[PDB]
Curated annotation (Swiss-Prot):
Subunit field text: Monomer.
Catalytic activity entry: Hydrolysis of (1->4)-beta-linkages between N-acetylmuramic acid and N-acetyl-D-glucosamine residues in a peptidoglycan and between N-acetyl-D-glucosamine residues in chitodextrins
Recorded GO MF terms: beta-N-acetylglucosaminidase activity; identical protein binding; lysozyme activity
Gene source species: Gallus gallus (Chicken)
The UniProt record lists the keyword Calcium: no
Expression sites (tissue/organ): In the egg white and polymorphonuclear leukocytes.
Name of the protein: Lysozyme C
Active site residues according to the UniProt entry: 35, 52
Subcellular location, record wording: Secreted
Amino acid sequence: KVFGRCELAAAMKRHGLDNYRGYSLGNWVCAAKFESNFNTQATNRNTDGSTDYGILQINSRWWCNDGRTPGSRNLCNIPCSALLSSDITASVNCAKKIVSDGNGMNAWVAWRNRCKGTDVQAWIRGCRL
Ligand code: NA
């Protein structure tokens, strides 16, 4: 399931992301756009033994358990399966932890390299949330 941009924006806002730890809603929609093109089923399996999962491409080396990633670390305390739902509950809850347990949204390579320093509110203005 791909989300439409404004549908996702509304869902993210209704899960508390608009201005979360200083990141306006547009940051999160932009991150999703460039991490996964809004695809809840996106998966990127890596040579280090980790995999990036779901709409925010959260990486299994640190944040979720998929039963096979070296170190078996799970800082969001979720199965990586929960990051592949059209239910964004786990992706949102885990993203909040990531931003609190580190150097903010720099955890997301696509945010850092595509969304940072831009007018990220462009991604949500037309939704009028
Ligand atoms: Na893991």
